[PDB]
Amino acid sequence: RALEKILADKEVKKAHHSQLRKACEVALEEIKAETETLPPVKSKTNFIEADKYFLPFELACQSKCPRIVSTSLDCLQKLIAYGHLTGNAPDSTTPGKKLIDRIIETICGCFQGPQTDEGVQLQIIKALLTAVTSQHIEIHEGTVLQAVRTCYNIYLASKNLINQTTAKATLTQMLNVIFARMENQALQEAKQME
Amino acid sequence: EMRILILGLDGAGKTTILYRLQVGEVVTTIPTIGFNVETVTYKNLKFQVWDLGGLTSIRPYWRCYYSNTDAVIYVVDSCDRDRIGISKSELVAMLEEEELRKAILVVFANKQDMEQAMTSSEMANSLGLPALKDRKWQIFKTSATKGTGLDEAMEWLVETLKSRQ
Numbered sequence: 001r002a003l004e005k006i007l008a009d010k011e012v013k014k015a016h017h018s019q020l021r022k023a024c025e026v027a028l029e030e031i032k033a034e035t036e037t038l039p040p041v042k043s044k045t046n047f048i049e050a051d052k053y054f055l056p057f058e059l060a061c062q063s064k065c066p067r068i069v070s071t072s073l074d075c076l077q078k079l080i081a082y083g084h085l086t087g088n089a090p091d092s093t094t095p096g097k098k099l100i101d102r103i104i105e106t107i108c109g110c111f112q113g114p115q116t117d118e119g120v121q122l123q124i125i126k127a128l129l130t131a132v133t134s135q136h137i138e139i140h141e142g143t144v145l146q147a148v149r150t151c152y153n154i155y156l157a158s159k160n161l162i163n164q165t166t167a168k169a170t171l172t173q174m175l176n177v178i179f180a181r182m183e184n185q186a187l188q189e190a191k192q193m194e
Numbered sequence: 195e196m197r198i199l200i201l202g203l204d205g206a207g208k209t210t211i212l213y214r215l216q217v218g219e220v221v222t223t224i225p226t227i228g229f230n231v232e233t234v235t236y237k238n239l240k241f242q243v244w245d246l247g248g249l250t251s252i253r254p255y256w257r258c259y260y261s262n263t264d265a266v267i268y269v270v271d272s273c274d275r276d277r278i279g280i281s282k283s284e285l286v287a288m289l290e291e292e293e294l295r296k297a298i299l300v301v302f303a304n305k306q307d308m309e310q311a312m313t314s315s316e317m318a319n320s321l322g323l324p325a326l327k328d329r330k331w332q333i334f335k336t337s338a339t340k341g342t343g344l345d346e347a348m349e350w351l352v353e354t355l356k357s358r359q
């Protein structure tokens with residue numbers, strides 16, 4: 001349900017970048033064919049799980065208008081925390097890394113130095129958080145590291161104290177989450193052998 | 195723009211409140227792990243309101259977010275007779291943090307609409323609110339679902355923030 005509203009809102013800001021506009025339109029159309037409150041819906045299969053519907057967002061993050069990057073980071077964070085973006089086999093890239101690791105890399109890639117918009121900065125920190133910590137999806141440990149890195153980068157090189165203390169916070173939370181998951185994975189290993 | 199933490203145990207109604215405040219409607223929620231942050235405008239004041247999850251395991255992190263907090267909306271389930279002691283002890287703990295010395299406290303005695311609800315007075319006593327030192331604070335009977343009491347609580351918070359050294 002959220003999907004439709006957000007995609008139309010995606011069309012509104014700018015068409016000077018025509019490729020982005022077109023990709024949003026195609027994804028919206030496929031949604032209408034599959035169909036044949038404005039915040040995102042519940043997990044169940046009845047709702048057609050939006051996976052490769054993703055691509056207009058990769059645009060939204062690499063768009064320049066920081067209010068639309070900020071928008072993208074937001075709605076991603078939402079639906080991924082709802083369990084709507086489970087991820088799949090490597091797409092348009094070499095294997096040894098699932099599609100989840102791809103979206104995370106594209107949210108890490110919205111932050112480049114202190115210059116970047118702070119609304120975006122925070123949105124990143126937030127998306128990065130509910131990503132690592134989603135009950136629903138596992139991560140390649142290198143993608144974990146990249147998440148951690150981008151966060152620590154925002155923490156050190158920010159110049160917006162809010163985003164500093166929240167990046168410090170999500171930093172703690174993320175590290176503690178992933179560490180605990182590694183702990184009981186190893187303890188199940190130490191017991192299944194038995 | 196002012197900083198608000200919405201805190202309180204898991205299932206209290208924190209998230210429901212946040213989005214009821216932002217977009218004026220009730221939405222369906224999940225347990226907030228990590229956080230939600232949204233910007234809320236009320237009676238023409240701009241608030242950055244942060245909703246954090248209340249799950250047992252994710253409570254220790256609340257303190258990481260206390261920095262530069264103008265006000266805490268502390269949401270308590272009025273029907274949860276079982277863990278109000280926990281609400282008390284967790285509130286006691288957070289008000290000891292130096293970061294929050296300047297902070298205004300608003301207690302949402304939430305889920306008032308429900309038959310099993312404790313009275314506003316009973317809850318205040320339960321939380322040891324009258325025992326509060328140097329806190330500007332008030333308690334409010336609320337329903338996030340029905341929209342009950344929210345505007346009253348917000349009017350109070352807004353007027354109270356309009357009080358500068």
Ligand SMILES: Nc1nc2c(ncn2[C@@H]2O[C@H](COP(=O)(O)OP(=O)(O)OP(=O)(O)O)[C@@H](O)[C@H]2O)c(=O)[nH]1
Pocket residue numbers: 202203204205206207208209210211223224225226227246247248249304305306307308336337338339340
């Ligand atoms: N009857 C009644 N039910 C409510 C009220 N407010 C919230 N609820 C319900 O109780 C649930 C509370 O969940 P949330 O709003 O996520 O509470 P939360 O404290 O944000 O939860 P965490 O983020 O997991 O700590 C919601 O699913 C609502 O349907 C209320 O005022 N009255």
Ligand SMILES: [Mg+2]
Pocket residue numbers: 208209210223224225226246247
């Ligand atoms: Mg919640």
